[PDB]
Design a protein around this ligand. Structure first.
Ligand code: FES
Ligand code: FES
Ligand code: FES
Ligand code: FES
Ligand SMILES: [Fe+2]
Ligand SMILES: [Fe+2]
Ligand SMILES: [Fe+2]
Ligand SMILES: [Fe+2]
Lengths: 407, 409, 407, 412
């Protein structure tokens, strides 16, 4: 049984919070590449770990991620002019480059003490797989940026739905490591199985854990299992089981203690992996249709996530369209921070139990001096993958030589 | 560098707050005269210093400013019947006059002495320069109402834009004593200088301070300065440099700790000064177009103050229309109470630093029992004015004998 | 100069108007396959040549295209129940199959054999390339359905934007055979040339014509021509010059005399050709963003097609987003039926002149009993293709051996 | 098969049109009582047979129905002041009484000979059964006003849904003389029968016709019939079969050739008949929810009458809420004026066939000088009533001694 205090430790990320300090030891997505446009594009507002950030791509094509508020008198830089190699605040014309250097102050003299040497909070960035990433941890702790398990290479197609969700990251992450839920919630959105009650096994690792959900297959149940294996990559990534054509990953980024940037990714061979808008349409996460311009969902508690009771009477399980929308209805109705003090977990919760244990330990150990889970030598790499396959009851799923879906 | 505690002391006005108590030693604008209409007109809701007020113009034409909540069981009087010399609560028919006497209790037997016992809290009021004013301090401290420096007399055209802004008053006031910002923020809304970096000087006074921004003028920069002088009139009024035709003033009234009634005033000779709707259209502060019926801006953070990025690519500096809306975008994005603990000020902030020093000092002194800054003998006058002028480098600006713009210059 | 009577002959299609009789000798797109759904799906409203149609996919997966009004008392069958092998009107329960046989009249005695005697107007249909096609000509004139030039085969990716436009088809058609327009209208959306004034050459065929716009190339304009060839496929199809990756076609179907279903198609090899939603987003034709649910544009004359004057001052040519929406602005402002009586045509209009001449000749010939242009032996095939290429000055562009783009 | 010319003759009512003339020989509902308010109430805009009307209740409680446009320069009197025994035009202050007499002209010299010489077109009116009625025919043809069949007495509860529909009156009327439609269209809205194909029989009368829909009952089907008898009262009223508690009638007033005021009425003993808002909610014809403030439906073609495809997949027949909205979807999708030249009518259409033949004869006869159908000693009275009952096959339904539903199971 978790305690109130453990819940807080697990979930809070703003400012002081140990869990944030840990998370900030990993490279984090801040926003989509598509949001920042061309050189001199419109500046973008973002939010990670309780901090408001401005993101902008300068004349040379470099992407900056900085504190949103001007270093001078803290007007929002989102309104500023992005040109001639920096972002210029509207108010008194201080201009910053993408590394946070103040290149100029319109109403100030000279250069030696205030003009150049003043440095606006700004983080290292990278662009990869359709996202802008930043390292928001102590600077001297920044590792080399390496390909995530779900975007191994410059030629993988990566297609992203982003949805800003008004609840804490941990209940969303839990929903990616919860194989049984597909067999209820997603049962109108379907495998060689109808088994609703899979056996769970978890293998902890240095970066998180891998787990397998074992279902009785429709044929030769005596002989084999339907294995679906998911990878938990700490702090807040799941590699969930692929389909026959492409892979699927979830990364979640805490905007603050009660909001999360949810990224749902189709990835694989370009000829077998949907493009962005196809993927969004399939998921019902189309900007302008399912989401507003800020990728916030139009489905909400007051319209019951557009649930359709007549669809449900007709045999549609949830009456909610777009399987992630079905997920969201469940997560948001748990409240801004799910109260895990009131859970009644079961066999199906095994990987969620492992998540809670592992992450609580990892944050206490980190606070006492260990490496942040999944950093340095520990890291997951693209050798890590989820998969699904009919497997011999006498083969160890943990040693099964599965690779990501390609060609 | 201010502490959190100094920032609280400067900014908070509600209830006890020292700065509220200081500010209430001065007559305060409550709402526009336009809002109260005619005798027996619709009652108006206002808020000052964290109090909800009802304002109304009775059958004899007198304006009352009173606590909004009925003294019986505290239903809002804003819904009541304004007629026959009083405001009558709908609920049980208690009727108050402009001075908060209860004239009548519809359901109370004249038997009891109740009707003459209850007095509703109501403030002394004045109407002047198109505003309803009230005196919200301890009554025995009420001074004679004298004209503001920006409304000298009955023959002055005074044209007002009112905007209710969801931030704290002090960040708004600071935006009025901040000469350098025009040269960036308002650069597409232009004077005989292209100088963006004015050198600043202040002269402290009994009622606040005057400051001058000096810029190199376009011609004869060798021997002359372009002097723009702004007057800070404590607690929260800036006489901003005039143009060639008319004067510009700003008075800010805290509605509470995180909201302010902003009044942006064109005043001068009628023949040279725009009318109200012309001024509002010029500033894009038109009720029904830029503002709702309560004078709240339709521009906001969610719509990004209607900033148009294509206009900015085309060369417009802020892509925001109406110069005060460009100011508002900056003030509001600093958050409901700007955190000055995080400022990094520079040369261009000298008046703002002065303001913080003087007001923190004035509030401390006032708590210790000194008179509230700018009251009694020390009060600003119509002779105090902002000014703009090409001035010889050998003339001390503090010495320039300026008058407020009138006719012919 | 065209006369009023020639303008009407060319443009009108309702009733027995000869041009509509001519067009109905060709298999015609009625709606997209994506509107009709699964077996027993929601019936769809369509309109072609002045007739309101209902389209539905029955329980066996067959598509019907039928007069919209019930043959009983003419209630709309769009509201009917699509199930159990047919479409049943709500009012008295008459049930039709996709061939317009009445299977049952809920309320009629079976004895007075009326159920066998009543047939409902229903048209032969075909599904191909993501569209539902019908043959709306006299029944015995129905030709074998062959693949159109832009959808050669079952392994071609065809991605379709559909827009319902409130003007007559012919002006929309003309817009696809008007090469010089790209060099103005679409100048901010572009090429091997900045020649704004192409010289024009046309070659008539039995199914339409091909033309070439010849531009001065970026140099070697002494040696070469930059050739873009478009193919007019009568009556209302334009195969437009490819890009280096995929092919583009336009087929327009008159809904009536003043409205047109506009189909703008990307087609080619699946790995080089965008998916539907990608195509629609590129063109700003996304349902729910640019279009309402009936595929009508939200851009219109009262909102000036969302023309942004600020973008124009910043150097964007039109201030209108999505190049087809730029064309649409121009077409709809010419009025419901463009008044060709008041054109002042120039050299750039040669292909438009050919079209006017050929279609007026075609329909005049057809009234006197000539086979409809482009039917039978003369019909365009996938060997007929548009192209674009530098063409050393000394070659007949007419002899150029282009194929569509594939890999 | 009707001709185009016969369709036009049956349906058009504006101005000269003979059907318009025929219909105007009957007292006509113009609006609901509840629209006219109290004395000095807000003037009401109404429209019958192609004329725009203003309706107001004056200071003394009387109701006027008059040409909407001021007799002076034709400004709308709907905007005028209703006070001091009259309606005064805002423009130049001409003031008219409910009889159309000009009481005053604000700007005309007191003894300008013009005052008591201008008469504005104003019709005789009657208030009854929660409606304002007017006599819009030639004044010397006006008959005494008698109770409608469906509102026999001052003690009767009458509850009305009014809906302004954008189609011609005749296709709406036909919808009420079409027993078979209920067994399909209204099959999710349901009786001692599941028979979908009633046998039909008609009995012509001097005011219209009665018809009987005969279905096999669910018990003793070989001996007994379930009889639903509807009465058509010309020109545009149907007394529809009652239920066990109360009575149901439809009166339709053409607003012009392509718009119709539809009144749908529950009536009977006050303790057995729902109140107005009850009835409206049940039918989904509530103002502010189903209808705008002018009683126009928010359900339309563009939103497919809010047809819910999922409800249909779950087994609801039409996916449209409130049985009249189901009717309306069918009527309006036939077009502003249904084209009867393209019908293919079967046995179920017998009452509609009869209505078409009867009303085309009546308007032909009338145009040539016969009395208007259903005027005079010929008038339907409250003795005429629809009914529903199980009846032995050996009994003639024409003979069944029906009375309108009243109390318990006893007559009135
Ligand atoms: S607040 Fe940004 S430059 Fe002054
Ligand atoms: S609350 Fe105001 S009179 Fe009672
Ligand atoms: S109108 Fe369709 S079955 Fe009667
Ligand atoms: S128009 Fe009515 S009084 Fe003149
Ligand atoms: Fe899920
Ligand atoms: Fe400003
Ligand atoms: Fe074009
Ligand atoms: Fe019905």
């Amino acid at each position: 049984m978790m305690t109130h205090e453990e819940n807080e430790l697990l979930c809070r990320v703003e400012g002081d919070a140990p869990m944030g300090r840990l998370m900030r030891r990993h490279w984090t997505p801040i926003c989509l590449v598509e949001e920042v446009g061309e050189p001199d594009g419109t500046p973008v507002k973002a939010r990670a770990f309780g901090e408001d950030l401005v993101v902008f791509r300068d004349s040379e094509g470099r992407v900056g991620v900085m504190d949103e508020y001007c270093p001078h008198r803290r007007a929002s830089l989102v309104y500023g002019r992005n040109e001639e190699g920096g972002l210029r605040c509207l108010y008194h014309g201080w201009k910053m480059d993408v590394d946070g250097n103040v290149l100029e102050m319109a109403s100030e003299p000279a250069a030696s003490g205030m003009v150049d040497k003043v440095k606006h909070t700004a983080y290292p960035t990278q662009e990869w797989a359709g996202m802008v990433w930043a390292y928001m941890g102590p600077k001297e702790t920044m590792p080399e940026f390496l390909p995530p398990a779900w975007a191994p290479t410059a030629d993988t197609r990566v297609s992203i739905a982003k949805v800003l969700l008004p609840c804490n990251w941990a209940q969303i992450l839990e929903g990616a490591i919860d194989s049984a839920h597909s067999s209820s919630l997603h049962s109108s959105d379907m495998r060689p199985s109808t088994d609703k009650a899979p056996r769970m096994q978890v293998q902890r690792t240095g970066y998180g854990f891998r787990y397998a959900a074992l279902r009785r297959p429709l044929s030769n149940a005596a002989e084999n299992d339907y294995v679906r294996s998911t990878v938990f990559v700490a702090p807040a990534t799941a590699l969930i089981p692929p389909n026959n054509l492409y892979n699927v990953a979830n990364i979640n980024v805490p905007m603050d203690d009660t909001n999360t940037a949810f990224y749902f990714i189709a990835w694989g061979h370009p000829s077998q992996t949907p493009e962005t808008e196809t993927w969004r349409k399939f998921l019902r996460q189309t900007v302008g249709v399912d989401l507003d311009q800020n990728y916030r969902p139009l489905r909400n508690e007051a319209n019951k996530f557009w649930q359709d009771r007549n669809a449900m009477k007709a045999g549609n399980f949830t009456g909610i369209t777009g399987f992630p929308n079905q997920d969201v209805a469940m997560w948001l109705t748990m409240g801004p921070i799910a109260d895990r003090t009131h859970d009644r977990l079961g066999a199906s919760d095994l990987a969620i139990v492992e998540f809670r244990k592992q992450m609580l330990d990892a944050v206490k150990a980190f606070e006492q001096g260990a490496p942040a889970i999944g950093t340095g030598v520990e890291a997951a790499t693209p050798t890590v993958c989820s998969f699904q396959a009919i497997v011999p009851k006498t083969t160890d799923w943990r040693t099964y030589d599965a690779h990501y879906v390609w060609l």
